[PDB]
Amino acid sequence: GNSQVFYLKYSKAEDLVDVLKQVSGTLTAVVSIAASKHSNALIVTAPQDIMQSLQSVIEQLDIRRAQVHVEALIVEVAEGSNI
Amino acid sequence: GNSQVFYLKYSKAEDLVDVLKQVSGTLTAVVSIAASKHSNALIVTAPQDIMQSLQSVIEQLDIRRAQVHVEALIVEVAEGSNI
Amino acid sequence: RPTILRDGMAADGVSQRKYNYMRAEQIYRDEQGLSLMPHTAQPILPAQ
Amino acid sequence: STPSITTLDNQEAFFMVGQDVPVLTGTVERKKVGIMLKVTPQINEGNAVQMVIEQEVSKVEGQTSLDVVFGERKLKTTVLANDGELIVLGGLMDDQAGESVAKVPLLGDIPLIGNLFKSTADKKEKRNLMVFI
Numbered sequence A, B: 001g002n003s004q005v006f007y008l009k010y011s012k013a014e015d016l017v018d019v020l021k022q023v024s025g026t027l028t029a030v031v032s033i034a035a036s037k038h039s040n041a042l043i044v045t046a047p048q049d050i051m052q053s054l055q056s057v058i059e060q061l062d063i064r065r066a067q068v069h070v071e072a073l074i075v076e077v078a079e080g081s082n083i
Numbered sequence C: 001r002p003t004i005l006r007d008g009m010a011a012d013g014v015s016q017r018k019y020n021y022m023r024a025e026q027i028y029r030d031e032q033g034l035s036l037m038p039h040t041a042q043p044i045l046p047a048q
Numbered sequence D: 001s002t003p004s005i006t007t008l009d010n011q012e013a014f015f016m017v018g019q020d021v022p023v024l025t026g027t028v029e030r031k032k033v034g035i036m037l038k039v040t041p042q043i044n045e046g047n048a049v050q051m052v053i054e055q056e057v058s059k060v061e062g063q064t065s066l067d068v069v070f071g072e073r074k075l076k077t078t079v080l081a082n083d084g085e086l087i088v089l090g091g092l093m094d095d096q097a098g099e100s101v102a103k104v105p106l107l108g109d110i111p112l113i114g115n116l117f118k119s120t121a122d123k124k125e126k127r128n129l130m131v132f133i
Helices: A013-027 A048-061 B013-027 B048-061 C008-031
Strands: A003-007 A032-036 A041-045 A067-071 A074-081 B003-007 B032-036 B041-045 B067-070 C002-005 D004-008 D020-024 D028-032 D036-038 D042-044 D048-056 D059-061 D069-071 D075-081 D088-096 D124-132
Touching (some): A013 A041, A013 B032, A013 B041, A041 A048, A048 B003, A067 D048, A074 C008, B003 B048, B013 B048, B041 B048, C002 C008, C008 D088, D075 D088
Antiparallel strands (some): A003 A041, A032 A041, A067 D004, A074 D124, B003 B041, B032 B041, B067 C002, D036 D048, D042 D048, D048 D075, D059 D069, D088 D124
């Protein structure tokens, strides 16, 4: 009711709590952001006005991350001839 | 609503937060600038008047960086003859 | 000699002349074949 | 040679096919050699990729004067390539020459039989190198 539990769908929980210790801590100008590491969930304890803000930020950060295949070539041509 | 999330399009997030800890910190004369490193986004928490200023600065720093190919030549000519 | 690279046309030019120059030199290592086995492929760069 | 890697966005990753050679400092310390490719790609909009590439091609050379020597070909640059297009990172187009003739002063420039008095050395050498991505 007061506090809620969000399941992150594309990101780790400890990264999101390491970000969100800074947002609420001056957004209040109490609050608790704790991250259950084993079960992939961070727990927000906040009033109703802060809850929609942090809910919107978690909705905007839980995004699909693309992946990149990097292929680096190496060419070496030599020639040596002495008479 | 109150806080927003900007996706940087040409620059890293940690550089932009290392710059923007100084702009808001005296521009207020609270504020929170935090950078999600894994998802390439910095998070601005500010009032509406500061938000347009920092939004304008982020719009003016997220610029296409040109790239330079440097080609350095080395010439060595020798001659030795003793009788 | 500095050389700034604007867009895909610039890296098209420089990367095309370096890549096709080195690939061209491997083609000159392909026509100039090995002295023993003509039926042995030289290491050559891809097409494009 | 062409190493390959598969990361996510903004997550560094490397690769190696080298060895571990005992390098003595006074205190023997294990030092890595071989083809390394440490990238940290970032996806910019317009489907352009910014990479922080720290490549190395090491190789154990012999000699062994006081300890073993290596040969490195490393580079630590930062490029901005397109979606699937190649870009040249570094390179070296070495080119040498050489000459060492050794005459006998008067009877060395005889145009007919003077050739069998001089020890005409030579050395032609040419070596190219590139690193693409």
